[PDB]
C-alpha cells in the first residue's frame, strides 16, 4: 500500500498561568506512535505504540531534543502572531502545525506537508510543489514574504524528501505487522421502526482499518445525500474504526434502498439491501 | 547590508571586565556567538531566538554572560578576563538557516597596558640592480615592534590607495616566536615599473593603521599613549 | 560523537582544479556550508548545498554531496592567485542551526610564472645605514626556510600580481641589526 507520516503540534497560551502548553503527537496512517506533553513530569518524547519501543536510546534522546526545540520555537511563534494581529496579551490563543510526508508501494516520496493554523483557521501552508507558500490573510503574507527571502521552502523540502521518508520507511519496516495491514469493515443493516409507517435503516461498518471509508445510501440507484444521517468515523479504542449511515424510509419501500461501502480493504465495494 | 560589531579590536588588562556589541542584519530573529582562534574553525558560544537565550555551550565559564535585551543588538560580557580569553569573537544572524557573520571583535588580554607599542615603519627604496635586470622597482615597507598583532597595512601612491603590485605578509611575525607574549613585525612589497619609480614627482607612502588603546584607557607612563593611530613612512621617486 | 574533518593545507598551480574535501557528522543535516576567510577577519558565506541535491554549480565553484557517506567537496574550476584563503565546511548541529566548523583548509595558489631568481639589497629612505634583503622572482616550489640565528628575521614568501604586465612574482624579505649581516647568504631556499 501507499503510506503517510503526520506530526501534529498544538501550542495554547494561558496568560497569568505561565508559559504556553505544548502537545505533540505522531502518526503513521491512523496509528499513533509518539507524543510529547510539556505539562508531563517526564519532559520526554514517549512511545504510544508497543512497536516503536524497539528504537535504540539515540532515537529517544534525539526525538526528545527536537520536539523540545519545536516547543520553544512555537512559544515564540504565539508572540509573533500576537504582534501581527495586534491582539492583547490577556487572551489564550492556539497555534497548530502539521508536517510529514507520503510514500507509495515502492517506498518513493509522493507528497510533503508543512502547514500552520492560528486560532483554528489556516495561517500558512507549503504548496504541493514544495517551492512556495499559500498565505491565508494579511498577517500570513508577512511570514510568506519573510520565508521566501530566507529560502525556508527549499530547506524544509530537504527534510521532507530526506529525514521524513527515511523515518516513515523505518517505521513501516519495524511496525510492519501493525502498519502494513487492512482490516476490512464488517457490515450489517438494522431496521428501526419510528412510527407504524416509518423506519430508520442503519448501515454499519465495524472493526476497519485504516479510517478512510465511504458509506452511501441509494434509492433505485440514485444517491440519497440529502436525507441520509452519517456519524463521524470513530475509534473503537483497539486500533480499528466504526461508522454508520441511516435513512428514514417509508414502511414498504425498504427494498428500493441500498447502502454502498467503499474501503481500501475490500476487493470491490459492497451493496447491502434490507433482506434479513 | 551585513552584521556589525563594536569594537573591531579590544585590548583590556588581565582580570578586568570587557563588553562587545553585535548588531545583526535588520529583523534577523536568530543570533549566534562563536569564538575563533588563529588556525581553527569557529566554536559555538550561544544562541538567541529573539530575546530568548535557547542554547549555550559548556565552553562558557560563569564569567561569560550574553544578553539580547530587546531581541535586537546582543552584548557579550567577560568578567575577570584571562590570557586564554584572547580570540576573535564572531557574531552571525539568520532569518532561518543562512548564517551571515560580522567582522568579529579581536580581543587581546595582556598582563599590563605598558606591553602595548605602536609600530615603527620605514620604506626601503628599490635596488639599482633590480632596475638594471628587470626594469621593475620593488619598494619594501617594514613595521616593527608593535603589540598586539592588530594592524592594516596599505600603500598610497600620489595620494591614491593602490590595489595591484602589492603583497603584505599574511601573518605578522614574532620578534621572539617561542613566547606567547612578544612584539611583532610585518613587511609589505609594492612593485612598480622602473620608469614610474624614476619620476621624482611620484610620491610613495606606506601606511599602518594600529588598533591600540582607547581615550577611556588609563596611562601612567612617559612615551605617547599607544592609541589607535596611523604611522606612515614615505619615499619620493628618483632618477638616480 | 565526531568532528567535521577537513585537511589543514592544499597547494594548487594557478589554472589547475582545486578540490577541497570534507566529512560531516550527521546524515540528517539538510544543508552544508562553505565559508572563506582572507587575511584579516570576515567569514564570507561562499556557497551552500541542501541534502536533497547531488551537485550545485556557481560560476568557477562546484559543490558535490554524498549524503549516505557524508562527503562534501568544493571544486574550483580555474584557480587564480586571488582564490588563496582558508575554506571552512560548516554543518548545522542539533536543533537550532548553530554551525560546527571544520578546522579550515588553507588554499595556496602557486604562480606558473617562469622564475628569474635574485637577492637584492634596499636602503632605508630616511638616510640610514639600515638595510633589508629581497628574495624575489624565485620558483613557486622553493622551500624558503625562516632558518636563522635569532638576530635574523626572514618573512614567508608571498605572491604579488602586477596586473598591467600580467606578471606574478614570489618574494621574501630578511633583515637583521647585526654589524655582520650580508644579503648574499641571508636566504636558505631548499628548492624541490
Amino acid at each position: 500500500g501507499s503510506h503517510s507520516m503526520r506530526y501534529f503540534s498544538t501550542s495554547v497560551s494561558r496568560p497569568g498561568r505561565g508559559e504556553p502548553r505544548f502537545i505533540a503527537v505522531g502518526y503513521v496512517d491512523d496509528t499513533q506512535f509518539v507524543r510529547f506533553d510539556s505539562d508531563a513530569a517526564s519532559q520526554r518524547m514517549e512511545p504510544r505504540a508497543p512497536w516503536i519501543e524497539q528504537e535504540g536510546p539515540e532515537y529517544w534522546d534525539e526525538e526528545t531534543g527536537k520536539v523540545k526545540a519545536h516547543s520553544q520555537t512555537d512559544r515564540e511563534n504565539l508572540r509573533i502572531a500576537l504582534r501581527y494581529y495586534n491582539q492583547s496579551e490577556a487572551g489564550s490563543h492556539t497555534l497548530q502545525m502539521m508536517f510529514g510526508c507520503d510514500v507509495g508501494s515502492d517506498g518513493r516520496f509522493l507528497r510533503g506537508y508543512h502547514q500552520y493554523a492560528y486560532d483554528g483557521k489556516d495561517y500558512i501552508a507549503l504548496k504541493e510543489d514544495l517551492r512556495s507558500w499559500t498565505a491565508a490573510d494579511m498577517a500570513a503574507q508577512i511570514t510568506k514574504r519573510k520565508w521566501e527571502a530566507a529560502h525556508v521552502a527549499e530547506q524544509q523540502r530537504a527534510y521532507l524528501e530526506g529525514t521524513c521518508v527515511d523515518g516513515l520507511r523505518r517505521y513501516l519496516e519495524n511496525g510492519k505487522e501493525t502498519l502494513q495491514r487492512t482490516d476490512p469493515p464488517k457490515t450489517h443493516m438494522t431496521h428501526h421502526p419510528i412510527s407504524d409507517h416509518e423506519a430508520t435503516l442503519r448501515c454499519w461498518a465495524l472493526g476497519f482499518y485504516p479510517a478512510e471509508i465511504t458509506l452511501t445510501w441509494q434509492r433505485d440507484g440514485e444517491d440519497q445525500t440529502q436525507d441520509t444521517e452519517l456519524v463521524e468515523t470513530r475509534p473503537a479504542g483497539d486500533g480499528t474504526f466504526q461508522k454508520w449511515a441511516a435513512v428514514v424510509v417509508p414502511s414498504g419501500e425498504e427494498q428500493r434502498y441500498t447502502c454502498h461501502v467503499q474501503h481500501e480493504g475490500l476487493p470491490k465495494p459492497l451493496t447491502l439491501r434490507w433482506e434479513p | 547590508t551585513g552584521v556589525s560589531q563594536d569594537p573591531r579590536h579590544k585590548i583590556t588588562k588581565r582580570g578586568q571586565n570587557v563588553t562587545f556589541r553585535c548588531d545583526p542584519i535588520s529583523e534577523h530573529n536568530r543570533l549566534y556567538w562563536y569564538r575563533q582562534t588563529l588556525g581553527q574553525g569557529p566554536e559555538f558560544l550561544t544562541y538567541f531566538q529573539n530575546e530568548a537565550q535557547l542554547e549555550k555551550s559548556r565552553l562558557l565559564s560563569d564569567r561569560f554572560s550574553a544578553e539580547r535585551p530587546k531581541g535586537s543588538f546582543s552584548t557579550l560580557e567577560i568578567q575577570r578576563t584571562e590570557q586564554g580569553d584572547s580570540a576573535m569573537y564572531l557574531c552571525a544572524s539568520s532569518l532561518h538557516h543562512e548564517q551571515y557573520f560580522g567582522p568579529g571583535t579581536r580581543l587581546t588580554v595582556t598582563e599590563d597596558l605598558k606591553n602595548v607599542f605602536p609600530p615603527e615603519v620605514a620604506v626601503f627604496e628599490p635596488s639599482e640592480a633590480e632596475i638594471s635586470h628587470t626594469q621593475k622597482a620593488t619598494l619594501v615597507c617594514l613595521a616593527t615592534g608593535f603589540y598586539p598583532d592588530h594592524v592594516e597595512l596599505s600603500w598610497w601612491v600620489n595620494g591614491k590607495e593602490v590595489h595591484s603590485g602589492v603583497c603584505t605578509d599574511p601573518q605578522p611575525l614574532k620578534e621572539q616566536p617561542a613566547l606567547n607574549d612578544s612584539r611583532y613585525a610585518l613587511s609589505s612589497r609594492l612593485r612598480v615599473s622602473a620608469t614610474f619609480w624614476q619620476d621624482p614627482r611620484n610620491h610613495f607612502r606606506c601606511q599602518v593603521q594600529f588598533y591600540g588603546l582607547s581615550e577611556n584607557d588609563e596611562w601612567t607612563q612617559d612615551r605617547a599613549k599607544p592609541v589607535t593611530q596611523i604611522v606612515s613612512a614615505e619615499a619620493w621617486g628618483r632618477a638616480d | 560523537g565526531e568532528d567535521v574533518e577537513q585537511s589543514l593545507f592544499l597547494s594548487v598551480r594557478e589554472g589547475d582544479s582545486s578540490v577541497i574535501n570534507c566529512t560531516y557528522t550527521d546524515s540528517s543535516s539538510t544543508y552544508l556550508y562553505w565559508y572563506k576567510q582572507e587575511p584579516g577577519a570576515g567569514l564570507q558565506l561562499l556557497t551552500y548545498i541542501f541534502s536533497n541535491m547531488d551537485m550545485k554549480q556557481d560560476q568557477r565553484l562546484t559543490v558535490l554531496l554524498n549524503k549516505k557517506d557524508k562527503h562534501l567537496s568544493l571544486r574550483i574550476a580555474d584557480t587564480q592567485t586571488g582564490d588563496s584563503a582558508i575554506y571552512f565546511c560548516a554543518e548545522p548541529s542539533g536543533n537550532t542551526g548553530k554551525l560546527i566548523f571544520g578546522q579550515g583548509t588553507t588554499l595556496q595558489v602557486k604562480p606558473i610564472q617562469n622564475p628569474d631568481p635574485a637577492v637584492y639589497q634596499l636602503r632605508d629612505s630616511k638616510s640610514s645605514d639600515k638595510s633589508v634583503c629581497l628574495f624575489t622572482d624565485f620558483d613557486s616550489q622553493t622551500n624558503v626556510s625562516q632558518s636563522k640565528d635569532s638576530d635574523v628575521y626572514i618573512t614567508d614568501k608571498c605572491v604579488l600580481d602586477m596586473r598591467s604586465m600580467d606578471f606574478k612574482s614570489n618574494s621574501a624579505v630578511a633583515w637583521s641589526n647585526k654589524s655582520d649581516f650580508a644579503c648574499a647568504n641571508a636566504f636558505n631556499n631548499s628548492i624541490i
Partner: peptide, 9 residues
C-alpha cells in the same frame, strides 16, 4: 523522525 529546524512566523 522530527525536524531539526522549525521556522519563525
Amino acid at each position: 523522525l522530527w525536524m531539526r529546524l522549525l521556522p519563525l512566523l
